[PDB]
Amino acid sequence: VTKPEKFQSETTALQHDLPTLQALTRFHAVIMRCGSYATEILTALELG
Amino acid sequence: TIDGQPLSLSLYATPADPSMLLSAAITASQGGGDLPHAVMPMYRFPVI
């Protein structure tokens, strides 16, 4: 929501669309597949 | 064979194993409560 650049570098406004929903699904799936390091991956994507 | 059935038996490929599903609990960190400005009242210490 705050930095939609970290979602995609072309977006700049997180949309209500079906591709944004599908990419949200795959993002959440990758983060939940990270498991024990999921918060570390998230806060490392918070920074660069 | 004479009937068209093959002499050499077929290859049996191994099916894929069922994967183990993973979840995670990502965590947040909001700021703490900061102290407001203190006002002096009119009553004494046990009353206040």
Question: Which SSEs are present, and which pair or pack?
Answer:
This is part of a larger assembly, with 2 copies of chain A (48 residues).
Chain A: H1 18-34, H2 38-46
Give your account of this protein's structure.
This is part of a larger assembly, with 2 copies of chain A (48 residues). With 48 residues, the first copy, chain A, is mainly alpha-helical. Helix content of chain A is 54%, strand content 0%. The first copy, chain A, is built from 2 helices and no strands. Chain A has helices spanning 18-34, 38-46. In chain A, helix 1 (18-34) packs across helix 2 (38-46). Chain A is flat, with a radius of gyration of 11 Å. The interface between A and B is small, with 9 and 6 residues.
List keywords for this structure.
about 50 residues, toxin, part of a larger assembly, complex, A component of insecticidal toxin complex (Tc), glycan, 2 chains, mainly alpha
Offer a quick outline of the entry:
This is part of a larger assembly, with two copies of chain A (48 residues). Chain A is mainly alpha-helical. Chain A is 54% helix and 0% strand.
Q: Give the N-to-C terminal Cα separation of chain A.
A: 17 Å
The share of residues in helices of chain A is 40-55%
Which geometry of chain A do the CA atoms define? flat
Number of helices of chain A: 2
Strand content of chain A: under 5%
Structural classification of chain A: mainly alpha
Number of E-type strands of chain A: 0
Biggest interface pair, counts: A-B, 9 and 6 residues
Q: Which series of helices and strands of chain A comes N to C?
A: HH
